[model samples]
Target chain A: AMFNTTPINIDKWLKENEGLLKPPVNNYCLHKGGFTVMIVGGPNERTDYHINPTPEWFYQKKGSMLLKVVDETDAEPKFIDIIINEGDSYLLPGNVPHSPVRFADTVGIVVEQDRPGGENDKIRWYCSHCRQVVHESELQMLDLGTQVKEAILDFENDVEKRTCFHCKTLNY
Target chain B: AMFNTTPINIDKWLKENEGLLKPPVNNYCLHKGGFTVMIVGGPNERTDYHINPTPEWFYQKKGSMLLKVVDETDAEPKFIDIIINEGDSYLLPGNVPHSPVRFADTVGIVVEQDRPGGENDKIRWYCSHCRQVVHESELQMLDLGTQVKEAILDFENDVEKRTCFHCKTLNYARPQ
Candidate 1:
């Protein structure tokens, strides 16, 4: 009988207070045991991708979401969308680059374990039109003490930050 | 990229295979990283209560559930009901006794962290009439290995196992 595992309105809470979070699209740990339990909201039309060591699990609460995975098995980069409807659960493989594109007003619950060897997480942007790599940054220490904040800060400050040369579209 | 985390029908798979989980009804549950993820179920009715070292999370996918908690702060355990409706999420605090009384075919998802430093968990029985402590068992470890397996095996057929001195009623742990 745990107290911290009280019932949560996963949708209402994240939709209302997610902005209070540092990254604005992040998760918190379980109260006592401290495992990663994420109840996160949409990218609001997000396109950036992430590569992580630990596995990430997702279950949609409301709306829909498209999870694009880079299937490296093929000669060319095969970006496929793992459509997650409401009440669906999806597990992203560990140490793979995956990107989530949120439909308006989408939110879900996610579960994750620790990165096995304390591996670094990474985030990268691809040119929407031409399929070229835009920017890639590595996050040392999955915990938010420093690396991630600095990396995003760097992405936000650069001149051609989210600009795609071939497509001429700015993600910034 | 790994393929296991691609996406899942959490509600469906569990509905189909949850019974495949071998148990003492005693399970650390699901196996998601960082935190332990448990997808457990209850019949139309349930009586046994669980007390753990950390918080337990719940997300109901089918039917309804009534969570009874004992407010230990009071001189006597003040038991109250925390109602859980379908699609509702609730968090139960650590070290509290929570018994989920399911209403016909109920199912839910729970998230929890590892027992800090490998702490022991417990399953207890209380008097239905007077709510007195009837019997207690400290789970040697969260994972039901040799310790808990042999522990429960010790009391396989004791008629007086859950018999209360004050009420004299036996809670067979079956639906009324």
Candidate 2:
């Protein structure tokens, strides 16, 4: 199964799942500077690839998934599929092209900055597949795009290095 | 004015300032584990001396006084006359010999560890003027011994070198 993990207007979702929301994931906001949390219910049957404009974190509270990323210069994006289950988290750096391609009925949360957070410093990019100008607000799975299958493939090859906190050396 | 920036218990004083306790002090147990906070209070006129087991952090939320600390081996304690007002804070390292020689009406707060939370660890050299074992919880004054005071003083002087948040350098002189 594959899916997209872009940002979406969660007001409708919140109004629907108002009861299941717990202590940490009780709040949700559409803009930057403030913090928010969401549960990504996923049994993604199709691939929905996308990229984000700001740095965000994904904590896998339950179930698992796969993610793939690419540098702008690379014609074929680098693939990294992660099987994030309960108590696992991954930091998605802003503006670095990436996508979530595989998962089944998984719930996750997203946190963003508040205010007109870095409005003037915003950078816009065009997705080749979506053929639309993706704003910073549309950085999560809720916005739009196809999941890059390559990310999952890359993750399968190097799961040990990606999740090790004591590695000291970072990919950046 | 010069003041003794040492730890003390202020449970009673905190009671008098109930109006100011709207927002109780924010405290969190360190996830990594290290220290604790204790409150100690006493009479304003007593010229009592004491020693703290752990490093002490003193905050003068109210009152005024003079504090003195001395090395146990030294013949005389060094005088630090201070007039404390509201919102004053002082940091003291563990096991330093200190005393309040004179003070006006005063109330203060002390932050200490809780291993035993008593004066068993303290080695008082005198009672009236020399050395004696005085329970910290019962006694009004504090006296951190010379060894502890010297170590704390050394820590105060070398705080920057002691902390390495960035891990840029190594302390090769000390054995691991």
Candidate 3:
């Protein structure tokens, strides 16, 4: 036995869950089948880069966004941006340091692998001035929505954690 | 490492493959990730009912279609229809006998499991007169595009296989 046969209507779903599309509540899991399917809303203030062991699939249903990723193949890992337009389906490979910059009124569906247990996600916050990772959090993400909120809250509350180790710049 | 981070634009892909979207070449595999993603074109002459062991996900991109399925819940299995509208995503569970009645100018993406080996797909053709199964085929579908073509050709050539067992009526193939 698996998930129900009901078709996921993107426009109708967003219309009903308008209130839940606000800040800190931007995403929610829609279904947990062979993959973890989620609906994410826009204008999210996420500066932290995250890396997963499993690949992620994205579909832009309403608006556009950019997935800023750090390519680690070269000597110095540099930022590479990927644009996801409306009605586009993208597949991001595993273990890539990436941060999705979502725009206002933008809505997308993200499909990630349904893990068993003990798979840790690497979350790193880079310095605003030097562009170096200042703080890092390795969390066993059972629930992405709640775990992301916790990671953000933990980093935001501490000024010492936000301070850049290399450039001595305080990210506020 | 996994697949590339490139975005698959549905409209752009369809426009480029417009010539291959005719008749027997109605569908083709787009990508193979954790699942085999495919782009299917419309007005397919698929009269045979097909069933798979893995779940199939469908996203209607251009037009609407009906997934006519046989629900074997009770003693007498009856037909249950599910409408897949444009921009709608529907997931059909495993081992369900289904046949998509695709309309003209329709386009959709189907996501099925990427099997290793020896997973047979059951394809049954029912009688036009009595609704009884006239012929069946169990195929190990490696390439869905070519396998579907082969299955259709094999059945079309044999009249003995097309004739209904109960009703004794011949089932004619539609013009491709």
Q: Report the number of the highest-TM-score candidate.
A: 3
Candidate closest to the true structure, highest DockQ? 3
Question: lDDT per prediction?
Answer: 0.64, 0.38, 0.76
- Better model by TM-score: candidate 2 vs candidate 3: 3
lDDT of 2: 0.38
Better of 1 and 3 by DockQ: 3
Candidate 2, residue B16: the lDDT equals: 54
Tens-digit per-residue lDDT, B59-91, candidate 2: 444454345554443555433444434444444
Two-chain complex of model 1, DockQ on C-alpha atoms against the true structure: 0.32
- Over A92-137, each residue of candidate 3 has an lDDT whose tens digit, in order, gives 7667888988888888877666444566888888888988889998
Every candidate's DockQ is: 0.32, 0.01, 0.37
* lDDT by residue for model 1 (A63-130), tens: 77777888766577777778888878665666667776665456667765455455878888887677
What does candidate 2's lDDT look like per residue over A1-172, in tens digits?
Answer: 1111122323345457745533211223332212233355554432223444444455454455555554444554343444445534455554554444434445555433221333222223233344233222233343222222233334334544333244333221
Candidate 1: residue A119 Cα off by (Å): 7.8
The runs of at least 3 residues in candidate 3 whose Cα sits more than 4 Å from the true structure, single-residue gaps closed, are A1-3, A73-76, A116-122, A129-141, A158-172, B1-9, B12-17, B28-32, B73-78, B116-145, B155-176
**Arranged by lDDT, best first:** 3, 1, 2
